[PDB]
Amino acid sequence: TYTLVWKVWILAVTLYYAIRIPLTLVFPSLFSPLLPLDILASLALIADIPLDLAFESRLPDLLAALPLDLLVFALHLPSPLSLLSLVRLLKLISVQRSATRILSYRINPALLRLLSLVGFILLAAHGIACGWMSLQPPSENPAGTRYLSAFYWTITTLTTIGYGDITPSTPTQTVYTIVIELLGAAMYGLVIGNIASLVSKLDAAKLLHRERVERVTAFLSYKRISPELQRRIIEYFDYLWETRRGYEEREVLKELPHPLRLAVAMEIHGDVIEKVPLFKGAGEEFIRDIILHLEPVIYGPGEYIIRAGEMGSDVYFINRGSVEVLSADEKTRYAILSEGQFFGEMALILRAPRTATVRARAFCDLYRLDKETFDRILSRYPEIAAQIQ
Amino acid sequence: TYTLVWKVWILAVTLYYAIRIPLTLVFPSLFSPLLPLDILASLALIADIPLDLAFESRLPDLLAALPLDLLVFALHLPSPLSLLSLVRLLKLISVQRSATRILSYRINPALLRLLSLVGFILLAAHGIACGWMSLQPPSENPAGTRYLSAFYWTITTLTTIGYGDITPSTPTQTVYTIVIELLGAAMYGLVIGNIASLVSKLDAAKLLHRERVERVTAFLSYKRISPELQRRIIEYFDYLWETRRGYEEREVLKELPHPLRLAVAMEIHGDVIEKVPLFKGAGEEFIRDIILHLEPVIYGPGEYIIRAGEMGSDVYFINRGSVEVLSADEKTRYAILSEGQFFGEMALILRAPRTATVRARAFCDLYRLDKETFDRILSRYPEIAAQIQ
Amino acid sequence: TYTLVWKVWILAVTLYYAIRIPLTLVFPSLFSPLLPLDILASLALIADIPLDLAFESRLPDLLAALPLDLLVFALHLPSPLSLLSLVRLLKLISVQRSATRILSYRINPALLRLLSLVGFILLAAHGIACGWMSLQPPSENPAGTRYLSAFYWTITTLTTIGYGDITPSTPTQTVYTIVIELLGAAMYGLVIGNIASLVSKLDAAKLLHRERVERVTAFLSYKRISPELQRRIIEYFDYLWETRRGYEEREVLKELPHPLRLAVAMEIHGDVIEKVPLFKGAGEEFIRDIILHLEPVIYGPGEYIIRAGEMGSDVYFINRGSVEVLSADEKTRYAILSEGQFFGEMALILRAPRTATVRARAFCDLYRLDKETFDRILSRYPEIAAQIQ
Amino acid sequence: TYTLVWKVWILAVTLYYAIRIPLTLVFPSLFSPLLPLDILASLALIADIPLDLAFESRLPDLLAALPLDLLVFALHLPSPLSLLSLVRLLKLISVQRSATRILSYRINPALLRLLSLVGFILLAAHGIACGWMSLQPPSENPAGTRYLSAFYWTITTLTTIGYGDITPSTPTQTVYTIVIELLGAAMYGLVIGNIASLVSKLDAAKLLHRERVERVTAFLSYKRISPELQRRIIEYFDYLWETRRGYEEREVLKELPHPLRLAVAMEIHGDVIEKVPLFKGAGEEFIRDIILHLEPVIYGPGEYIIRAGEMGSDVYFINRGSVEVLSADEKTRYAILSEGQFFGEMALILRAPRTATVRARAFCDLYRLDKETFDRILSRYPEIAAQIQ
Ligand SMILES: Nc1ncnc2c1ncn2[C@@H]1O[C@@H]2COP(=O)(O)O[C@H]2[C@H]1O
Ligand SMILES: Nc1ncnc2c1ncn2[C@@H]1O[C@@H]2COP(=O)(O)O[C@H]2[C@H]1O
Ligand SMILES: Nc1ncnc2c1ncn2[C@@H]1O[C@@H]2COP(=O)(O)O[C@H]2[C@H]1O
Ligand SMILES: Nc1ncnc2c1ncn2[C@@H]1O[C@@H]2COP(=O)(O)O[C@H]2[C@H]1O
């Protein structure tokens, strides 16, 4: 758990190198003031190059391990022989790999890639400003002012803005500006593509539900469906989006493995069947088997779950909604059933027409178990089929 | 239902603050002329900060509740001590959250996010123009003209255009222009990504049908399918796209819950089975059970639904098309069947070869019920199996 | 079929209006030279406004029907009272709707939307150049040269390039340039989004096959699969992509309706079962029923379809590949089977171990029919079960 | 295998032509110095135009075959009559087609299209620089310097940067700059769209797993699932992503054909059933049949695979994890089972309650075979049902 601070320190030291080595390349009078920090960074990299193998393609790390920057700056080598100090930025590839490895589970990978690209773009802009120094004619200008001008020019170039108040004056400056132009176009396209990918998946669930509703309502309007049924279906879809975020229970449950799905079924509806008087005198295997076959169904307000006098082969367990039960002819209210309650128990023990109708008060979700699955389950458990009969 | 006008008023007051507080920061001679509106806005925010809890992360609302802007403007504090008045824009986050909460169901969420980003970009452009005032050297220029120049510069920057006729002249102006450059690149990328996400889902159904047709025709061309069958399949796909928008009936129906699917089946084909002479003397449960197993099939023009003399185990209910019936050898036209009619009733009561052939005149859609599902349904209802036999 | 030329003429006349009315607004000395074309266009629009109801939201058409442009130009009304002539561009909305309606089936809808946006952008650029005339100070410059300058400026603005050699000089010019800046950013974002949507679906099948291969090979590498089996699976996937474009036969077939799927099965494998000696003395219903249950399987080179001495319950019909049959111990080659041939016929008439092994020479695709479906089919046709026994 | 070097040579020769013919159009004093290379390229194209038919829409190849460039340059034809030499770039279309044909399987097609577009954009930029020469006024400037200026201008235009330090001065230059402006906007939009398409599919598997986890956890949080079960499910999903990259075994296996799936089952679990004492004295057909019905299930740490005293109808084969077995009441550890081992063998030979419980130590993956599939398999093989009983 203590490797996170070490990785953060590696981030800090590699950013310090990325900001320092091109500035020191530009200004030779910068090696000595930051010499202690430079040697500290070098020894940190040396001590980190074996530490990567502990608690874990490695060519960039090896290239950025040995200190080329110290030799070229101490010897005051010319620019072609000092451009080899730029190998310290090979640490950035391994840093980005480690960052994607450590915090991918906590941060959206598209957003993480976008922030990594933004940081790399800022570092590249600093490097391009330093390169702009390398070709700008010498002048009696403060280092801060000329760095501000170079950073302004490179930020104008990368963002494809092109004010034109800072333009090349020498052929080498023109070649460098063409290269930076192409690089800035490439990274601006990368930024826009990353933003587009992030945005297109920002509301994936909402868009999925929207197209789900649109296709259903278009199909219904083709089939000449009355506005009442259309409004009821739209209200059901709105309730589904507001409660389950438009996710069907069956699709989510089947995507889980057998033991996790069994535990989920336990926690969702084990109490509601534990209240059930019929299923006592039975082992936990029978309970798990019957609740693994509970098919959820959502009933809107004013909908008839069943009709009295009809055959009936289903048993319903209320999960989160509230539902009312009326008489056979639906004049008087027998009782009120809420979460944790169940009805239709008479259908399991006897094959006779139902006694009373039950209608949903509001949007209620309940689990329906047909007689086929119940008979299949009790067939595997003859000892349970005795007392129920 | 009266909270919509209150939310609209909150929108208006927060936009007024967003347009006012930076302008008043720029021009000190603006606090007094808009003092009544300022105090009205302040009292509206104070009265709204408890109203959010009624009829419903809250840190921005609390930050934007108390009036920092009134204190700094009355005391004429310097710019570093008056930048704290910008906390009133924390109301914008809650405003955007409320806007996404209230009208997401009525407006495409991608388009809603795009418009919200456009409005925020306009407000940010106004703020950036005000900041451009804050660093522009003082001059004897009208407020309108200098605001027009600043807004022109910031709109040029944000849209990544960069005319260059308005460029920084001071180092602080250069730093501010770099910051605004990065911000404008970021928001232009955001705009382009939002537009790309909106466009990619503009014709999701049409693109789905297009790739559906393309894969089918490529597979058929691989299998050496004659141009006649290819043209017939293409015509069927065109009819499907023009009627059902390329949506299969089974996929749409199975995506609905059991009661809503039952009601949809009711409205689609309850009349066509109510005409059916065979199914009278039966309860509504049997009707719902049989029509819940009706598998829709689309028959193109000139296609043979069945052949006379063949065994036959299907019954078809015309839904929206028109179909013709010929003789066994197909010389004479027996009759014409249209929407609401049905044929194949003889197969349900007797297992004998069919008497006559039936061929589709135009593109007709009808529901086919095989003998297996019918026998399964009537087995559950022995009382219905009596009169049918 | 003669409405296509009329729609093309409407396209030409509305483009002529879009290019003419702003130019004539800019140059008052342009109404008379194009007066015959103007009145011809007006009468064409008048005669077309009832023709839309024949052989087929209509508010833009009604607005663009009556000739506001003729009145304002003849009366030489000022700019605020002549801006009402721009209602003729309301014809563009109906033109775009008709274009999307007529040729959506022949041209990729994303590409069609991109071209429509490009044309609208060109027309808008012409209009913006005309507006640039409307605010440019009067000068002794040729109309062609000033139009070229205005079009250059507007094309620079819309493409977010911003050279800056043409910049506003008056406050009204600055406001117009800000508006055109925002519009150009919006339409450039629209162009980029349309291009991104078009590109993301350019290789949908290829990308689907690529991710299909990648997930399979990653899962196999996780399960420690030898390089031989990995190479065989990669070769099979390459063959599948090169022949069927990565589309599984079952997925394509099940996406078709029952009669079209039956006809496809007819054309694919009716000859190969017509050669089959066992299935003669049988009606076409039995043939269609058995071939509707043919499950396709792809066998790579060197793969064992079955093994001699094993029980065996499958019959295979070669479709497009070439396959060889060896002895029971696989020393001698019994024969060579090609497209249109079949083997495994002994398993249908007798439940005994197979006599010889059969191995694929090259990548061969054949249809496998297990004994379960065959027994189910022949059970429905007892008259066919006689001679086969 | 020797056609790859020929295709590379064609690439080199067509790039040489693309860089040469516009430069020679600009500078008439360039035909003679590169005459041997020109005639070598011409003869290479002539010898390649029949070679395309060997070891394989052809109109561009025929157009670019015959040497129009040699005639116009030798005759020193004017620009309108020498623009016909640009037909040599028709070779680029066939080159791109061949490149997409040869290395699509080895390189991501989106990335390949992006690189092809980048190369075409560089060639077009060179051509646009040459066209900029064609309209630039003659001056005593070195060819290198003026080419650098033209390339700088065209790169500024295409990347939508627009510095403005190089602007048109003549009407023809203005028209050319407008055309290049539109072309640069189009290709920049193409680059951004290609980058967006590449990025959106960079982490398709990771994004799929992320949305899989998000929908599951949202559904569970809706159903009031305790943080313990939520954490267990999150840990299982993390393990699944880290091992199988979030791919379910069933989905991957069913996407393979029957023989390849059979071979995969062989290699995955043939040894673990070869250790099994019960299944000896059985043929390979029975082994393949039983292992083709092995349903994989993933059990997290601390999870109960079965419970002692319960009926039990499953047999589990450990594949990659490690699992422990305890007593019936779970006080003592019976043994330790690892990869290649199996338990639950008693359920196959006798229908009695299980003797001991088995719980997973760490995340273990094992294949569960229920009694239904085993009974179905052994029913087809009566000779195997003897010794097992
Ligand atoms: N007053 C009530 N309280 C609780 N449950 C009831 C009441 N009336 C009817 N039910 C249930 O509703 C069912 C409808 O008919 P059943 O025969 O299935 O058995 C009935 C009971 O399970
Ligand atoms: N003239 C007709 N009018 C209506 N239906 C018919 C006519 N002729 C045949 N049919 C139907 O077409 C069916 C074809 O053969 P069946 O034996 O299934 O029973 C037949 C009737 O259901
Ligand atoms: N020489 C051959 N020519 C054609 N088919 C053959 C030949 N030898 C074997 N077969 C087929 O291969 C099958 C393998 O064993 P069966 O008993 O299924 O019946 C066999 C025949 O159908
Ligand atoms: N000590 C052990 N070593 C290996 N396997 C065991 C051990 N104890 C129990 N099992 C297995 O675990 C199973 C649990 O109950 P069964 O009756 O299915 O048969 C048991 C054996 O297959």
XYZ file of N, CA and C and ligand atoms in Angstrom, chain D residues 306 314 325-326 334-337 341-347 350 352-358, ligand 4:
91
model
N -21.121 -26.502 -2.719
C -22.284 -27.283 -2.319
C -22.313 -27.359 -0.796
N -24.573 -32.249 -9.128
C -23.553 -31.586 -9.925
C -22.187 -32.200 -9.654
N -11.675 -28.482 0.694
C -12.825 -29.282 1.099
C -12.773 -29.468 2.610
N -13.898 -29.218 3.271
C -14.027 -29.361 4.712
C -14.944 -30.537 5.032
N -10.601 -31.773 5.025
C -10.396 -33.117 4.493
C -9.148 -33.185 3.621
N -9.025 -32.273 2.660
C -7.904 -32.273 1.726
C -7.891 -30.935 0.994
N -6.964 -30.808 0.048
C -6.826 -29.622 -0.788
C -6.851 -30.064 -2.244
N -7.723 -29.448 -3.035
C -7.859 -29.759 -4.450
C -7.376 -28.583 -5.289
N -7.788 -31.392 -10.718
C -8.540 -32.263 -9.829
C -10.036 -32.027 -10.000
N -10.826 -32.896 -9.374
C -12.276 -32.832 -9.477
C -12.898 -33.397 -8.209
N -14.151 -33.018 -7.964
C -14.920 -33.541 -6.845
C -16.370 -33.697 -7.283
N -17.202 -34.194 -6.371
C -18.588 -34.467 -6.687
C -18.822 -35.713 -7.505
N -17.854 -36.632 -7.549
C -17.999 -37.829 -8.369
C -19.048 -38.779 -7.808
N -19.342 -38.682 -6.508
C -20.304 -39.592 -5.897
C -21.717 -39.354 -6.410
N -22.022 -38.132 -6.853
C -23.364 -37.824 -7.328
C -23.696 -38.521 -8.641
N -24.616 -42.426 -7.574
C -25.630 -42.653 -6.556
C -26.340 -41.346 -6.236
N -27.673 -39.780 -3.436
C -27.677 -39.671 -1.987
C -27.138 -38.308 -1.583
N -27.460 -37.842 -0.375
C -26.923 -36.554 0.080
C -25.402 -36.560 0.117
N -24.818 -35.403 -0.189
C -23.370 -35.279 -0.254
C -22.744 -35.467 1.123
N -21.504 -35.952 1.126
C -20.812 -36.287 2.364
C -20.128 -35.085 3.006
N -19.526 -34.207 2.208
C -18.738 -33.107 2.742
C -18.981 -31.843 1.930
N -18.750 -30.701 2.570
C -18.832 -29.408 1.909
C -17.482 -29.042 1.305
N -17.523 -28.250 0.238
C -16.319 -27.757 -0.417
C -16.469 -26.256 -0.629
N -10.845 -35.733 1.263
C -11.367 -35.589 0.022
N -10.579 -35.625 -1.076
C -11.084 -35.484 -2.314
N -12.391 -35.299 -2.571
C -13.295 -35.244 -1.563
C -12.822 -35.390 -0.179
N -13.908 -35.297 0.609
C -14.983 -35.108 -0.197
N -14.619 -35.078 -1.493
C -15.518 -34.891 -2.646
O -16.519 -33.949 -2.298
C -17.813 -34.517 -2.593
C -18.905 -33.964 -1.727
O -19.904 -34.965 -1.557
P -20.128 -36.105 -2.662
O -21.037 -37.150 -2.061
O -20.546 -35.409 -3.936
O -18.661 -36.753 -2.909
C -17.587 -35.993 -2.393
C -16.230 -36.194 -3.050
O -16.355 -36.218 -4.463
